């Protein structure tokens, strides 16, 4: 059987596991009594592997062998501008392998191993699995893992691969605002209501407009940024004090991983205090060359360093209203989820966007996504106290084909309810052409050069025939997980010839994943 | 997963009770996406469709549930009730066609408006019948070849030989077989295919295939049985059972049956569409047009007919008949 299915929020900075059992939903605390665990992995010089609180608590004294924010590298390529820019800001070594960013660390004894970003996330999911196993007293084999609503195809498939390596059958990847909406409607049966979910966390940002109705969750429009969150807010404060320290002492601590990571930890602590205080102090003894650090960060200064980023979070709210053809007066409640929504300026911009409407209070914004994942996990396990929970979720990105001239020809438009299928006829351009190549793109821009490349597919096995004669129907199906599957079939009359498809996505093959699964089972 | 389908069905029924039919529609659709073989969802979705008086869709959902569960009581009962309603819907649409075809033939043939439209419609029929198979010749280029007897540079000889072959086939039918009082023979079918494929393939033009070819997942008769199948086909032609059929239904069945037999290597579609209009023209109906844009729909109803149900094909031919009658009445 499926056992006890758990819900895991796999966040950029913080992960959280919960279960729906015995007629209620519970967040499960780790071995240190913490309801939420940092998405951290570290390797001590003695050879001990650390995950979670222990991995983060030694970041300052071991920044090169401490891995974090791997969610900003999963499902990406080495040539990704976001990847190349994040290399300069991460204290651990990232090398190119199979055109993908791989993490290289020292595991003690002078031996250095290289991990795929899916393997790093697999360790975090393993810590969440073991946290639930220690609480339930039995092995956990199935789970529902959260992903940002704006994750693309590669990011969604990579997250499922991380669960596979962690020894988990990912029954469902659930979008964060959809999961947050489930947590909002668990105690409410009030008919049809329009909800706007504002999900701003450590590394990602999502805004979804949902129509709730007594257990039915209908996502109308979603839009956001997978690379916008609290980590970018801390960096603005980090870069401010690095220039200030250079101005006062003439020292450039930019190349010192130990000093920079000490500043990042204290900057993140001061940001949390500034949500309830107006001034926070940052003290770091032996910060650089035995010189201590002592500065005060004002809330007004913190808002000043991030005001452009704070204001940019209103554009997705504007886009989901335009796509849904709804006005501000149509929104019944506003739900703020994610750790970064605790910022008073964020709550002020959202409130002033909706003309002073107070957001809905009640659900912990740090755990709301984790609650909904657990409730959906209870539904998929057939729990006698879940109800008829139905999720009508959509795809965030428009799938298109690159035609002649670099034009983005829309196949499946954005905000299309999943699962969905779309078929289209393709033919050959030259006589006796044995292969037809199709390039799929994700994005809303008119030209494919501005959109993200999902993959290049080739339709081999075409028998000799004049141009225009072959009739290949290619079907594009997006599953309930939001992941695309491409299939081709001959539609002309005569002998039905098999059309084999090959791609250049260069993702983790099943043989490579099985090696990573066995390498993880050795712990 | 299938466990999620039952929940979507429960909410679909719950939203139907409250009058939220648009949301119930989506939930019915989501249920069948989670489990395409959900017998309960298929049956309840058919009840939902029948409430909107979409009995044709309801009968499809009922039949789809009975292919999985042949003894499902609620599907058997509701399909029996829906069967007379489907016949009434098809008869009602035929009566609308008879109301329009008697109106277009009531005006005298000497009218300049009708004769001008009928003249340019001829080249339209040649255009649509070859372009639905992949011919890239434009209407003006087709008219240029037939009227001036000058080739069009930059266009392939095969595409031009198809147009000229179709022109010789329509002129033969319009002046020898339409007004002929006698019955339809095998030599008539062989003579139309000889005209259709005469310039493209002079070898195979005017003779049946001697080898067993395939038509997709559809298996046509064996070569030694083609002539027997063709003789029984033309025996179904000129029959009292076929005359009692509606002219649209009779011309549509003769279209599919000839495609079903697939007696030639090539030109089966073009030959069947010519036979379809010859039947319609003999019954007083104007020749209908299966437009180039309807290529995919034409394939879908053909594939549906090859898989048990030829009624969607007949309704497709009927909708094509009403479309050309509306454009003819637009001249007045
Ligand atoms: N009181 C607070 N004030 C300001 N920021 C906070 C506060 N509490 C937490 N945060 C930030 O919120 C983020 C963590 O929230 P969370 O919603 O878990 O994001 P996440 O785990 O990275 N999920 P995601 O970003 O969508 O991948 C971190 O950047 C924290 O620094
Ligand atoms: C699902 C399905 O049944 N597809 C096949 C539909 C079909 C098409 N035809 C006619 O056959 C000729 C071409 O045949 P090829 O073997 O050369 C064409 O006119 C087409 O309309 N019959 N069934
Ligand atoms: Mg989290
Ligand atoms: Mg988020």
Author numbering:
A (entry chain A): 26 to 548
B (entry chain B): 102 to 433
Source paper text:
The heat shock protein (Hsp) 70 family member BiP is a major chaperone within the ER that assists protein folding and degradation as well as contributes to UPR regulation.
In order to gain insights into the fundamentals of FICD-mediated BiP AMPylation that directly regulates ER homeostasis, we here solve the atomic structure of the FICD:BiP complex by X-ray crystallography at 2.6 Å. Since the complex crystallized in the presence of AMP-PNP (a β-γ non-hydrolyzable ATP analog that prevents intrinsic ATP hydrolysis of BiP), BiP is present in its ATP-bound conformation. The SBD and NBD of BiP are docked to each other and the conserved hydrophobic linker is tucked into the NBD of BiP. The complex structure reveals two distinct interfaces. The first interface is represented by the interaction of FICD’s N-terminal TPR motif with the NBD and the conserved hydrophobic linker of BiP and buries a solvent-exposed area of 706 Å2 (as determined by PISA40). The second interface with a size of 298 Å2 comprises the interaction of the Fic domain with the SBD of BiP. At the center of the interface between the TPR motif and the NBD, the linker residues V415BiP and L417BiP are engaged in a hydrophobic cluster together with V241BiP and L128FICD. The hydrophobic cluster is enveloped by various residues engaged in polar interactions, such as the ionic bond of E105FICD and R197BiP and a distinct triple lysine hub consisting of K121FICD-D238BiP, K124FICD-E217BiP, K124FICD-D238BiP, and K127FICD-E243BiP.
